[PDB]
Amino acid sequence: FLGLTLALSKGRILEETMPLLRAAGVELLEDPEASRKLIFPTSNPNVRVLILRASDVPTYVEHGAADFGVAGKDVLLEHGANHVYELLDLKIAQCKLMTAGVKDAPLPNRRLRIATKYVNVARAYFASQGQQVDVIKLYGSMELAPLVGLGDLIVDVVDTGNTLRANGLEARDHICDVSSRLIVNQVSYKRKFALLEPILDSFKNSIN
Amino acid sequence: FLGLTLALSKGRILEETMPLLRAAGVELLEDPEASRKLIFPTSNPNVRVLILRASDVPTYVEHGAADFGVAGKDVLLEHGANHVYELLDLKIAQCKLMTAGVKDAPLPNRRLRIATKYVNVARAYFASQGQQVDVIKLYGSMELAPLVGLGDLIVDVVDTGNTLRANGLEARDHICDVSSRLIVNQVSYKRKFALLEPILDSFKNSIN
Ligand SMILES: Nc1ncnc2c1ncn2[C@@H]1O[C@H](COP(=O)(O)OP(=O)(O)O)[C@@H](O)[C@H]1O
Ligand SMILES: Nc1ncnc2c1ncn2[C@@H]1O[C@H](COP(=O)(O)OP(=O)(O)O)[C@@H](O)[C@H]1O
Ligand SMILES: O=P(O)(O)OC[C@H]1O[C@H](OP(=O)(O)OP(=O)(O)O)[C@H](O)[C@@H]1O
Ligand SMILES: O=P(O)(O)OC[C@H]1O[C@H](OP(=O)(O)OP(=O)(O)O)[C@H](O)[C@@H]1O
Ligand SMILES: [Mg+2]
Ligand SMILES: [Mg+2]
């Protein structure tokens, strides 16, 4: 396969990317949500799709296992984006990185413990507020951590706030806005520009 | 809540732990698989259950957010087990950590690239075979990596081998056997032994 490999994740990124792909002449031939398969052809024989965990999208793209991909800004910040090119803000899967804690709970008298999957972002954010914190790395369900006393605050993505409210948590600080971004492998950009360019141009047009 | 908090993960660990818990006088009051909730009461008011991602079970237990938990040996090896006590091999969720690659593909002429979530285990295993390797950290779907040239081999858990065979991969090396283990917080063991002891004794009896 000499064409382009596009890395996407299931759920909202796949759902919100499909219209952009359609407008660019690229449609999946089945629903990846209902398949155990991971590589999918498209209506365009020069483009195939990898379905990955969101956290693996930057990894595949960086290493050139995919030529390009759609990754949340949150994942990019956490992973590090210095070995891919971020070409477009697609303005999909929009949310924000925030700190949160138990509603009205005071902070304890010591170095704070932050429970989060976004360990690098958490460290950098608290450092920008003048604080060195301990970070506890979690892989899921951040909202539970404050309720059982694992960490004093969490760092997580918030959209509606329903998850925080359902668990008696409140957002404390706004870290940054997050949206999904189009990222490209630095070599693929140079060597497969002829294939990439119309798709990138289509995406840019669609997001206007 | 002054009783015991038990950390479990969904799927096979929950499924294979429930009979042990039943025999110990502990039953869930609903199916956690069909709930968004994360804390669950049991038939015993001294015991509640946290449902966590498997990789977070050791974390919660180590930190004392749970008093005890059931974690796969694979997760324990990767996370590090020096700040919990491993008390029982429950002999559930039995599988093995293995290396795997594309069937009959020769190794390349350079330092190997291992794609895996088990980065510490991979490093230690290849070091025991006389090799320093590069490790690429992945969070899911290891089987895809060799097929798109991300890494030369993977390290993953294998049971039937169906996943490897479905993807044209073959197991190369047997790293170790894996089963789920009962782990306890080092302080909880000391301070809540009266609550723990009958449950531990019941589990031990059940697994005989
Ligand atoms: N509630 C939300 N609303 C909008 N965007 C979100 C929301 N939650 C996460 N996102 C964004 O969408 C991306 C897709 O990730 P997601 O499908 O939740 O997978 P994962 O659970 O593996 O992070 C996230 O990395 C983030 O940028
Ligand atoms: N196919 C399998 N058969 C038996 N045990 C398995 C299998 N796959 C994983 N396991 C074991 O069961 C544990 C439960 O993890 P699992 O439910 O697969 O969650 P995750 O996908 O987050 O690792 C694993 O950490 C491992 O020890
Ligand atoms: O502010 P809200 O609108 O509640 O969104 C916040 C939640 O959205 C995401 O969950 P997702 O829907 O991806 O489910 P999961 O992360 O629990 O799998 C994220 O992990 C937060 O928990
Ligand atoms: O040798 P096998 O019998 O095929 O088992 C191996 C597979 O089992 C586990 O997958 P699981 O069923 O937990 O699904 P997931 O890891 O893809 O979520 C593991 O992640 C392997 O992919
Ligand atoms: Mg999610
Ligand atoms: Mg699994």
Same domain, A110 and A83: no
User: Within this chain, do residues B34 and B110 fall inside the same structural domain, yes or no?
Assistant: no
Whether B74 contacts B27, CB under 8 Å: no
| Residue B147 sits in the same domain as residue B196 | no
Q: Which of A50, A59, A139 sits opposite B56 (nearest CB)?
A: A139
Residue pair B36/A165 in contact (Cβ under 8 Å)? The answer is: no
B119 and A CB contact within 8 Å: no
What are the beta bridge partners of residue A112? none
The amino acid at A202: S
Q: Which DSSP helix (H) or strand (E) runs through B188?
A: helix B186-191
Kindly state the helix (H) or strand (E) to which residue B174 belongs, with its residue range: strand B169-178
Resolution (A): 2.0
**Is A151's C-beta closer than 6 angstroms to any atom of ligand 1?**
no
Instruction: Give the number of the ligand closest to the Cα of residue B163.
Output: 4
CB within 8 A of A27, min separation 6: which ones? A18, A21, A42, A43
Task: List all residues 6 or more positions away from A24 whose beta carbon is below 8 Å from its beta carbon.
Answer: A198, A199, A202, A203, A206
Q: At what angle do helices B193-207 and B12-23 cross, to 10 degrees?
A: 100
Q: What are the residues facing B6 on neighbouring strands? A: B49, B68
Cα gap A197→A192, rounded to integer Å: 9
Using alpha carbons only, what angle is made at residue B169 by residues B166 and B175, rounded to the nearest 5 degrees? Answer: 120
User: Which residues of B, range 5-24, sit inside 8 Å of A by Cβ?
Assistant: 5
Question: Residue A207: which CATH number?
Answer: 3.40.190.10
A12 φ, ψ (degrees, to nearest 5):
-65, -35
The residue of chain B nearest to residue A136, with distances taken between CA atoms, is B59
The CA distances from residue A84 to A66, A76, A147, in Å, are 11, 10, 38
Interface contact A147-B63, CB threshold 8 A = no
Whether residue A102 is found in the same domain as residue A90: no
**DSSP-derived pairing of the beta strands B134-137 and A47-51:** unpaired
Nearest Cα to Cα of residue A84 among A106, A105, A65, A110: A65
**Cβ–Cβ under 8 Å, residues B64 and B142:** no
User: B 147-186 residues with CB below 8 A of A?
Assistant: 147-150, 166
Report chain B residues whose CB lies below 8 A from the CB of A39: 144, 147-148
- The C-alpha torsion from A81 through A87 and A89 to A93, rounded to 10°, is -60
**First vs last Cα of chain A: how many Å apart?**
32
Cβ neighbours of residue B133 under 8 Å, at least 6 residues apart? B111, B112, B113, B114, B122, B123, B126
Please write down the HEC assignment for all residues of chain A. CCCEEEEECCCHHHHHHHHHHHHCCCCECCCHHHCCCCEEEECCCCEEEEECCHHHHHHHHHHCCCCEEEEEHHHHHHHCCCCEEEEEECCCCCEEEEEEEECCCCCCCCCCEEEECCHHHHHHHHHHCCCCCEEEECCCCCCHHHHCCCCCEEEEEECCCHHHHHCCEEEEEEEEEECEEEEEEHHHHHHCHHHHHHHHHHHHHHHC
**Do residues A155 and A122 lie in contact, with contact meaning Cβ atoms separated by under 8 Å?**
yes
Domain span at B43: 1-94+177-208
| CB half-sphere exposure, B193, CA atoms < 13 A | 6
Closest CA to B208 of B122, B88, B37, B94: B88
* Shortest distance, CA B201 to any CA of chain A (angstroms): 26
Cβ atoms < 10 Å from Cβ of A8: 26
Same-domain check for residues B29 and B65: yes
Establish whether residue A95 lines the binding site of ligand 1, counting it when its CB lies within 6 angstroms of any ligand atom: yes
Whether B186 contacts B66, CB under 8 Å: no
Residues B115, B77 share a domain = no
Residue type present at position B73:
K
CB contact under 8 A, B148 and A50: yes
Residue that the structure tokens 């398949």 belong to: A35
Cβ atoms A65, B149 nearer than 8 A: yes
Residues A76 and A168 in one domain: no
> Cα(first)–Cα(last) distance of chain B, in Å?
32
* Technique used: X-ray
Chain B contact for A136, CB < 8 A?
yes
Quick one: A2 and A65 in the same domain?
yes
CB–CB of B7/B57 below 8 Å? yes
Residue A173: what residue type?
D
- Rounded CA separation B41/A19 (Å): 44
Q: How is residue B109 written in tokens? A: 């002429």
Determine whether the shortest distance from the Cβ of A75 to ligand 1 is under 6 A. yes
The overall longest dimension of chain B from CA atoms, in Å, is: 60
How many angstroms does the Cα of residue A12 sit away from the middle of ligand 1? Answer: 7
A23 shares a domain with A76:
yes
Amino acid at A58: P
CA dist B111 and A50 (Å) reads 26
Same domain, A4 and A89: yes
Give yes or no for A50 touching B (CB within 8 A).
yes
Distance B9 CA to ligand 2 centre (A): 9
Number of domains in chain A: 2
CB A110 within 8 A of CB A154: no
A46 and A4 in a single domain? The answer is: yes
The label of the residue with tokens 């088990």 reads B118
Q: Report the C-alpha gap between B138 and B148 in whole angstroms.
A: 14
Distance from CA of A167 to the nearest CA of B (A): 9
Q: Is B121 helix (H, G, I), strand (E, B) or coil?
A: helix
Here the tokens at position B5 are: 């908090």
Same domain, A82 and A4: yes
Nearest to B63 among A55, A139, A150 (CB): A150
